[PDB]
Amino acid sequence: YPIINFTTAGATVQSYTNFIRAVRGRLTTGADVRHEIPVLPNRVGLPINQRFILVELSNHAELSVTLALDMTNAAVVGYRAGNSAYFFHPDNQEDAEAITHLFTDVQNRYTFAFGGNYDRLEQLAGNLRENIELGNGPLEEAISALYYYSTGGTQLPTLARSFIICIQMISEAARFQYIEGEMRTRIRYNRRSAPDPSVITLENSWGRLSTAIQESNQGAFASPIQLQRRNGSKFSVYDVSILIPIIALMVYRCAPPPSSQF
């Protein structure tokens, strides 16, 4: 599986931008672009060889973890730390089989009894995303915490939190140039801060936004998607056009309709 390397140690907007673009690049098959927005490969019929990408994370503590990301949704499905691999509870038997092809050389393989969704992760962490700071510091700490879980030095809540940080700064950043931008700004000013309502609502609405765009009539949404701005004010999305600078990747939701060209 393709590997993308990133270190939080001395991370800059550029090195982070390079990292997200590389991840996004590996996530972009070029086979499916809907209104200038790449669509992630459909899960059905997707060969196991084309299923995962690896995100090797290093930090200032000289620790390394390797996150496995699912091509179909850019989601972290689990990670490797040393001779151990840890996987989120598979949502189905197909995914359960799929993950057996990840880190096949580790001595120890563990599947968490919990999934890698925010709701579960937030409950486990004892904190909502809103109250979990993001930035290079949080990610630096997330990597150490993920690594020390393999040596028994990390509690499950801190894990969870760490997963929440990693997912937003990697999976959501790849999915959204906007969220990438939010992370870039954090790094630019060494800012450590919880995601504002614009980041939260984009994350929550990623699937619905993907569906709305793919099911849109020439880009026009049949029904608006309610988002929030940075200040928390209601922002309604009626069209793909305003999402083009915002959403970088879509989860596959339907086949592109036969081109109805004028």
Describe the structure.
- It comes from Ricinus communis.
- It catalyses: Endohydrolysis of the N-glycosidic bond at one specific adenosine on the 28S rRNA.
- This is Ricin A chain.
- It is classed as hydrolase.
- With 262 residues, the protein is of the alpha+beta class.
- The chain has 7 helices and 10 strands.
- The strands form 3 sheets. The chain has a 6-stranded mixed sheet with strand order 1-4-5-6-7-8.
- The relative contact order is 0.14.
SSE pattern: EHEEEEEEHEHHHHHEE
Can you summarize the main beta sheet? 6 strands, mixed
Question: How would you classify the helix and strand content by structural class?
Answer: alpha+beta
How far apart, in Å, are the first and last alpha carbons?
Answer: 42 Å
Q: What is the number of helices?
A: 7
Based on the coordinates given, report the CATH architecture of the largest domain: 3-Layer(aba) Sandwich
Which overall shape is indicated by the principal axes computed on the Cα atoms?
globular
Radius of gyration: 18 Å
What is the name of the CATH class of the largest domain? Alpha Beta
- How many E-type strands? 10
Fraction of helical residues? 25-40%
Strand coverage percent: 15-25%
- The CATH topology of the largest domain corresponds to Ricin (A subunit), domain 1
Total domains: 2
CATH homologous superfamily name of the largest domain? Ricin (A subunit), domain 1
PDB class: hydrolase
Keywords: immunogen, ribosome inactivating protein, Hydrolase
Assembly: monomeric
Entry title: Structure of Rivax: A Human Ricin Vaccine
